[model samples]
Target: DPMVSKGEELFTGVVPILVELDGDVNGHKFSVSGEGEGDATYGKLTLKFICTTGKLPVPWPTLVTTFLMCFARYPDHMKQHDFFKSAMPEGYVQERTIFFKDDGNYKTRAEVKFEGDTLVNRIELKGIDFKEDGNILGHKLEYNYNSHNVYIMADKQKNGIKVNFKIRHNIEDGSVQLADHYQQNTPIGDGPVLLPDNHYLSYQSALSKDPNEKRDHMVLLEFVTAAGIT
Candidate 1:
């Protein structure tokens, strides 16, 4: 038999889920990790940013994630897998930029530089008109569709990764929806409504007041994950 355990260990460390680069931020070095887990049926992009120096600025994490939403694509390794090939073809480049509109005005201009199918250092974002105040940096994040909801949180594992974001499709009418069999309710909204067992959950932003026995936090684009959940 082959050295099975060693082979698995080698594959795990070089899984290519983590981008092979560190981003420079405010004269400090920040590491980047974008891990994806999915089948042809669905996909999830889990991105993380960690500052080598002390604390990171308030908005860098969100800004970097947004940049990713604007330009990142499914990584080539995942796209080449048998599970992903039917939905995504192997290509010279799979990168694409996304846009959003508010009152008919377009927001954020972004682009990426690639060598064949691989993304190399150059990522740009201009025309950012965010209402919040913060510092921004360069990097890739995720490609999210309009129907998908995004989640983010502090890593909390003391593993040095500061914050992480996960983007996945919103669940359908009921508590959970299978990819092929969606009930497709409009006014009703999507879910993960109640916390899944042993999941970490929090609000998208701070709440004005405590809730009145309602899981209002689940109502909007809140953060929910089982990352470090035991």
Candidate 2:
């Protein structure tokens, strides 16, 4: 009970990230509507995502679920969840420093600061690192505590080739798990391998060799929180 606050914990309810990718980039007509979740406790921290526009490569959702789980647990790099201590200052001029290890041979530093009522997270990486666990190492996600909207960015031109996600809270009692009955063939970092058989679908997404596929312009995502928290 000491690990989490009785008042405001890391996760309260089912936070679904309803995403819609609609934009033209590299002559490719990108259109998709997807659903993602971020409201997970420490035990089953895995997120759940479903796509309606296109069929994911089976491993995509699994890979992402592992990411959300890791992010929710390691956001403060505290090795444990102490929401009361890790929560926003609820005041002014307060800052929290988070230091973590990257790769089996590297360590990195990050910070979460309170700028007025909004939050500013700073990640010390510039390029994408699959070994670091999804996009947790690159850029940072910024948003307000009272709101679910979040943006992965450091500046306007900093993070363009990425998608924006807003985890919405869903009101549900029983927990949900995807691919809970499946098994994994390989593992990705501290996550599940890029295999569909496993629930933690954390895998390495191959980079496109085509010049056009190498770049992304923009992305839009949104969701609501479950209405159970009191």
Candidate 3:
């Protein structure tokens, strides 16, 4: 028989602040830590996911990490979930920065202005409140958001409900040119209100130091309704 080889596990680096959350799944406890904090809007607050007691199943990290982040990000939406009740006091925030209490009804009417090249020049969210949480930057609220709003704006631009364009490439010349160029705009929800059940929206943006690349921006609008809950 061939000689058996021994396996080794390696642990590296250091994490100072560690916190245990109030909930668990499949015998696994929720633990979180501070990834980093900076003065920038998106980088103002961050979190690092640590290990759980039990093994998290497939896609475990994503599901758990999302809930934890949304829990910290949106208090109003979390309150709508029965299983997501929080024992933490009013304005309570976790020591290790897992959760923060910034509870309120956030609603706004927004206006977005684009420049000649379809670049976002300015945006206004009317009736939204802005405050400084532990480490978070500005937050916006829109009651019963309609993803169709973006489409409406787009439709208004081209005099049609749908605006379509594609990048044309020349195989012989190895050149590509976009016609009627417009950045891709995707509306998350068709036309439903996203706050009552299984609702939360998280927005993040990153600006690169390199001048060549465009600044990256992302918006996560999720609606995961629960089942059999009182």
**Best candidate, lDDT:** 2
Model 2 stretches with alpha carbons more than 4 Å out: 1-10, 43-71, 75-230
lDDT of 3 at 29: 36
Evaluated at residue 151, the lDDT of candidate 2 is: 22
Positional deviation of 169 in candidate 1, in angstroms?
16
* Model 1 per-residue lDDT tens digits across residues 1-230: 12222212222221222232333333343333332221211222333333333443222323333322212122333221111122111211112222222201112222222234332222222333322322122212122222333232222232111222232222222222111111110111121111111222222321121255232111112122122232
lDDT of 2 by residue, 1-230 (tens): 34334323434554343333232212222333333344433222222223334433112321221222222322222323222222333211111111112311111122333334223332221112223232222222221111322222211232111212322211123322211111111111231111111011122111112234323211222222212111
Cα error of candidate 2 at position 209, Å: 26
Among all candidates shown, the one with the greatest TM-score: 1
- Please report the TM-score between candidate 1 and the true structure: 0.26
TM-score of 2: 0.25
Residue 2 of model 1, lDDT score? 25
Every model's TM-score: 0.26, 0.25, 0.21
Q: Give lDDT tens digits, candidate 3, residues 1-230.
A: 01011000000121112222233322323332212221211112233333343332212222221222212222322333311112111111111111113321111111111123121111111111223331112222211111111011123332212212222212223432211212212222232111223222333322112245232211222222222223
